[PDB]
A = this chain, B = another copy of it.
Amino acid sequence: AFTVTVPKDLYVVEYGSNMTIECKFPVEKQLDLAALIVYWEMEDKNIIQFVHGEEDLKVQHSSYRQRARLLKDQLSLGNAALQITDVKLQDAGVYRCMISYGGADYKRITVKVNAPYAAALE
């Protein structure tokens, strides 16, 4: 039975650092990327749309331009891992990874950003 699992449904991270958030899906043999769809989003806001072997960078929310990537080697292990670099306060909230690979499921991940006083300022 196809499910997506997260080893951590919550991450606490420091402002400016990098994070990698992970969804696991079953891969028993050679990854068939023609059958694989990985979608990552924070709102509403798209971060990854990986259909049949490539990103659709076209549709990615501006706020994730070049700070966000899916580690494609990790995919072969059944690990859709989104790495975000240079973490901002705006990156805090609910993420969703949706994966389809002979089955379909998704999981929710919550990200908290701790920041020093200097950084938090409106």
Contact = CB atoms under 8 A, between A and B. Distances in A.
Contacts of A37: 100, 103-105
A85 to B, nearest CB: 27
A51 B103 CA distance: 9
Contacts of A106: 39, 98
A94 to B, nearest CB: 7
A94 B51 contact: no
B94 A98 contact: no
A28 interface: no
Given A51-B103, A100-B100, A100-B104, A94 B44 contact: yes
Interface in A98-114: 98, 100, 103-106, 108
Given A51-B103, A100-B100, A108 B39 contact: no
A23 to B, nearest CB: 14
Nearest to A36: B104
A7 to B, nearest CB: 19
A115 to B, nearest CB: 25
Contacts of A51: 103-104
8 contacts: A37-B100, A37-B105, A39-B104, A44-B108, A98-B98, A98-B104, A100-B104, A104-B104
